[PDB]
Design a protein around this ligand. Structure first.
Ligand SMILES: [Ca+2]
Ligand SMILES: [Ca+2]
Ligand SMILES: [Cl-]
Ligand SMILES: [Cl-]
Ligand SMILES: [Cl-]
Ligand SMILES: [Cl-]
Ligand SMILES: [Cl-]
Ligand SMILES: [Zn+2]
Ligand SMILES: [Zn+2]
Ligand SMILES: [Zn+2]
Ligand SMILES: [Zn+2]
Length: 85
């Protein structure tokens, strides 16, 4: 029985969120989490596929579109993520 999708809230720190996004070339996967960052502390990991931002599906979007969805939410973001194998 596979692990379920989950919601992770991250607040931007002085040095940003501390996660990055890269296509695996479908949806964006969380990558390059900075040690000691809000991303790490909130429970993101580097096989998380981002499927929604702030309740909005990002499944049809490219890198620029996912980035924009996140940036326009100000200084926090609410991600729905699920495991990529
Ligand atoms: Ca914008
Ligand atoms: Ca703009
Ligand atoms: Cl940032
Ligand atoms: Cl990024
Ligand atoms: Cl941002
Ligand atoms: Cl913006
Ligand atoms: Cl905008
Ligand atoms: Zn989906
Ligand atoms: Zn980028
Ligand atoms: Zn771009
Ligand atoms: Zn870019």
């Amino acid at each position: 029985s596979p692990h379920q999708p989950r919601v992770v809230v991250i607040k931007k720190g002085s040095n940003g969120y501390g996660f990055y996004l890269r296509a695996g070339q479908k949806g964006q996967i969380i990558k390059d989490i900075e040690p000691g960052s809000p991303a790490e502390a909130a429970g993101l990991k580097n096989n998380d596929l981002v499927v929604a931002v702030n309740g909005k599906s990002v499944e049809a979007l490219d890198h620029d579109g996912v980035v924009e969805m996140i940036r326009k939410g100000g200084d926090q973001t609410t991600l729905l993520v699920l495991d990529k194998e």
